[PDB]
Design a protein around this nucleic acid. Structure first.
Ligand SMILES: [Mg+2]
Ligand SMILES: [Mg+2]
Length: 257
DNA sequence: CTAGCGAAGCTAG
């Protein structure tokens, strides 16, 4: 059995208490985090080790930041994308936990389709595809998860017409998401829940979480042997409902053999 | 609207 949660925390300094409450109550075997927004030396290692967790992370000042936190030791830790070796933004970290290759990604947002950050998003997703393919040549059990900043289909958008060919929802971005699906990966949530709105992000503005209008952009993609044992996927809107919350909700997947 | 940086108003999401 194995339980893995992904969360875009948006500043790990701010929401560290909520991370520790997440690791205290029905804790997962693996928790990965995006948007730490703290430098490499500022990670709260001691506070998480006190509770019995191993941590491998990649951080920079102010932006980005990824982390893997697990009960067992994360082995063979890789930083970044080989096809993009000069990108200073800390967005990818991979490690093998309990024989399962975890690839944690905080994907480029893109801002706008006419923004330079969208070209950056394009190249970054290409490099990600190459890295994930090469990693899949070596690991039967693989999970590529995190904040993809891409709503796969219209059912992942509270409103497909105003988001028509807008950032997160454009046909190009969905073709990138499909490029990662074509390597042999399964959208685990859509396997367990083929129908319905399972939004994972709600804009801070306009009380959009209260209106329950958001996007499903936080995903857990799994290899074939992982989908064979895939049993459940849930969006922790309760964490999203907390005071001073992240705009993303945690997402958990549950497997067993 | 929130968070960072840093002292105000951009950048980023
Ligand atoms: Mg955010
Ligand atoms: Mg459409």
């Amino acid at each position: 059995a194995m339980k893995i949660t992904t969360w875009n925390v948006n500043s790990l300094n701010v929401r560290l208490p909520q991370v520790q409450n997440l690791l205290a109550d029905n804790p997962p075997d693996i928790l990965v985090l995006q948007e730490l927004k703290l430098d490499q030396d500022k990670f709260p290692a001691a506070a998480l080790q006190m509770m019995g967790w191993h941590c491998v992370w990649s951080g920079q000042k102010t932006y980005n930041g990824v982390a893997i936190v697990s009960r067992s030791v994360p082995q063979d830790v890789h930083f970044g994308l080989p096809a993009l070796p000069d990108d200073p933004q800390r967005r990818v970290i991979a490690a093998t936990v309990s024989g399962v290759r975890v690839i944690n990604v905080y994907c480029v947002n893109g801002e706008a389709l006419d923004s330079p950050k969208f070209k950056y998003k394009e190249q970054w997703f290409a490099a990600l595809t190459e890295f994930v393919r090469d990693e899949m040549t070596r690991h039967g059990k693989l999970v590529l998860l995190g904040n993809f900043n891409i709503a796969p289909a219209d059912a992942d958008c509270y409103d497909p017409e105003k988001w028509h060919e807008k950032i997160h929802c454009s046909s190009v971005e969905r073709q990138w998401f499909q490029n990662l699906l074509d390597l042999g990966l399964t959208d685990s949530l859509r396997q367990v829940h083929p129908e319905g709105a399972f939004y994972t992000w709600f804009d801070y503005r306009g009380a959009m979480f209260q209106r329950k209008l958001g996007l499903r952009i936080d995903h857990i993609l799994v290899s074939p042997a992982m989908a064979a044992a895939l049993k459940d996927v849930r969006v922790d809107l309760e964490t999203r409902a907390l005071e001073r919350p992240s705009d993303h909700a945690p997402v958990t997947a549950e497997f067993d053999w």
